[PDB]
Design a binder for these strands. Structure first.
Lengths: 102, 50, 56, 186
RNA sequence: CCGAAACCCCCGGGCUACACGCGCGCUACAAUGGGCGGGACAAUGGGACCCGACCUCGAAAGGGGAAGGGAAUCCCCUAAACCCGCCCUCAGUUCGGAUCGCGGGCUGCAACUCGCCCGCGUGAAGCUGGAAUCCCUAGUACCCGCGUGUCAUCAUCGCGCGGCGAAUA
RNA sequence: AAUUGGAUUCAACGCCGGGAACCUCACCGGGGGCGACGGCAGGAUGAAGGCCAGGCUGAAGGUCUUGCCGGACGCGCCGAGAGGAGGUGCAUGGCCGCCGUCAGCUCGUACCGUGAGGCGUCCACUUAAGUGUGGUAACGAGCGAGACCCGCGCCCCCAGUUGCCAGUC
């Protein structure tokens, strides 16, 4: 066997949790021991911008959020038990990284 | 364009080449013979007379 | 007469004149470098399709 | 680079292809682009009121659209798919592009407004607005505001619920800006 | 409307010229102070020709070597205001830092015009400001540093963070 | 020499400039240079492109003198293009400032008035609000504003390679 890390991030809240939940449900029952889906930070990205193209009078200034959230999953299964679980549909728009070590 | 450029001389049943053939690269490339300074023809190289 | 090519050939190693956008084609006007080189004015028009959120 | 930048790279990728295809596929009747991104061949799903223009006049346009996609991106085997929009009259961006053609054509203002209003209210629009900022064929900067039913509310759960389609309908004396804001039942 | 041009290419110069006027701001007129040392404390963020541990040389600016890091896991990073002891003992000064000589680094083809820093020398006005006038009502103002954008380099700017923490209504 | 331009009372003056040493750049001085597609006359009897070397250029076969290659099509005008950060924002689309984060604007049916219109949406009380309350020849509805969305205090569940001589053989 081979301890795999699924490191899964997404740009929006609804898309990331459904995959994290589904990954912990399908893997649960087979030849997998699975450590729980741990939430790491939101590296919230602030873009802080000038609205007005005149830059004139008072110019009201847009605050921007890009929030990118990262769930992490350790798993003890084969490379074949890994693809079976990576079958799932996945939101657009959800990055799934795989490191493989023994 | 620029006419006339008939600078190859004529024998009676043969031809001969007026200009010089380069000694840096092989034959096939003629020299703008200045008398002391050789330009190149294919590309454009500063060559001196050997 | 005859002359060799030109499409500009001077130094533009770095600065603002080095940059151009991928929407309004400018040097001095804004170039947001996060891998989204556009002016500030485009940025505002484009963002809701990007997925940025107005809310503070 | 990292997690953060790549997502923005992708979204920037959406815009460069959605900007060009709108402007071309005004003959078809542009309404969207469902873009499925893979390492095999970028799969773009072009949304049209009508698929018979997008294909082309004998395969030309679908191949033309396959060929400019290779230039912008580094996926050189991009597929083309045409999905219909299921209600183009519920889509505002279709109605904006559709209204723009009609004003390009020269048909009168309130007439070209009435029909439009009437075709989408028949379709199922809780409420609808058309605004037409422009010269209005003189030389004063006045907009004309065609109004029925409910409208966009307050805040932002305003703008998400409604539809909004914008189109510059070109003329040869000036310009007229075509705004069409639809409110679907919800 | 222009059509070897109100195009196009190039180097150099100009936008950084000044007897002056104003606007918006920074820094400031010291003992609630300065040096020196020691100790106790954050947060947003940004980081691949990019942040740079740590080790070494250099007075330093920086240079040489080199770990980790595409990130809650590594780096910028030290917060600053604070307080305690010591030296100093209210003068245009040990204030204040303009102006000028020199030595020296750093980026780029290149910083004289026109960059910033470091060291020594230089050491200007200013010792609380008329008429007039602006901003704001609480974790705010007042105050102290901190980051980021754009970005080599010009930041006494713009956006944004936490630390101390009220008056009057 | 040029100190590019625009902006001008609130609402032009840290403004377009979220980055002027060249670049940027639109200004000035000097050297050098492309004009599509058609018509017209020209063509390979060798380049439209390249190039030593002087003579000239701040540099560039760039230009002349001068001599020449690789393989093959382009001036001059005439309509008429590409280019122009070249003019008109009192011709505009977009977006934005300010009045104004203000508290208004409408429609149905009824009712009144010869009619433009009125009434309702007025009055009393009350709120930041045409907000709500009572009254009333009105009764209701939409937009605006409001809730709605995001952020902040306190707790709990799910989850822990961040977190610690917490509790510990």
């Amino acid at each position: 066997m081979q301890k795999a890390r699924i490191k899964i991030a997404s740009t929006n809240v609804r898309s990331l949790d459904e995959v994290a939940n589904q990954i912990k449900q399908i893997a649960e029952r087979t030849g997998v021991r699975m450590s729980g889906p741990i939430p790491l930070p939101t590296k919230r990205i602030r873009i802080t911008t000038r609205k007005s193209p005149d830059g004139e009078g008072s110019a009201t200034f847009d605050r921007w959020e890009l929030r990118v959230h990262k769930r992490l999953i350790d798993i003890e299964a084969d490379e074949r038990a890994m693809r079976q679980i990576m079958r799932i549909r996945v939101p657009e728009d959800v990055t799934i990284e795989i490191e493989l070590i023994s | 364009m620029g006419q006339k450029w008939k600078l190859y001389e004529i024998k009676d049943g043969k031809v001969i080449r007026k200009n010089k053939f380069c000694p840096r690269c092989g034959p096939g490339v003629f020299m703008a013979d200045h008398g002391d300074r050789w330009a190149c023809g294919k590309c454009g190289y500063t060559e001196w007379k050997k | 007469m005859a002359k060799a090519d030109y499409n500009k050939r001077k130094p533009r190693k770095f600065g603002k004149g080095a940059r151009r956008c991928i929407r309004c084609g400018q040097y001095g006007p804004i170039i947001r470098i996060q891998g989204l080189m556009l002016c500030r004015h485009c940025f505002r028009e484009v963002a809701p399709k990007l997925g940025f959120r107005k809310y503070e | 680079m990292a997690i953060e930048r790549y997502f923005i790279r992708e979204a920037v990728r959406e815009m460069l292809i959605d900007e060009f295809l709108e402007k071309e596929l005004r003959r078809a009747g542009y309404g969207g682009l469902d873009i499925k991104k893979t390492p095999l061949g970028t799969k773009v799903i072009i949304f049209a009121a009508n698929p018979g223009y997008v294909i082309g006049r004998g395969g030309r346009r679908i191949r033309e659209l396959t060929r400019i996609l290779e230039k912008q991106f580094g996926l050189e085997n991009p597929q083309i798919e045409v999905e219909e929009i299921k209600n183009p009259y519920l889509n505002a961006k279709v109605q904006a592009v559709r209204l723009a053609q009609a004003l390009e054509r020269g048909i009168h203002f309130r007439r070209a407004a009435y029909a439009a209003l009437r075709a989408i209210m028949n379709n199922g629009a809780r409420g609808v607005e058309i605004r037409l900022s422009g010269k209005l064929t003189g030389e004063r900067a006045k907009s004309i505001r065609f109004y029925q039913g409910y409208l966009a509310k307050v805040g932002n759960p305003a703008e998400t619920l409604v539809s909004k389609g914008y189109a510059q309908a070109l003329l040869k004396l000036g310009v007229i800006g075509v705004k069409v804001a639809i409110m679907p039942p919800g």
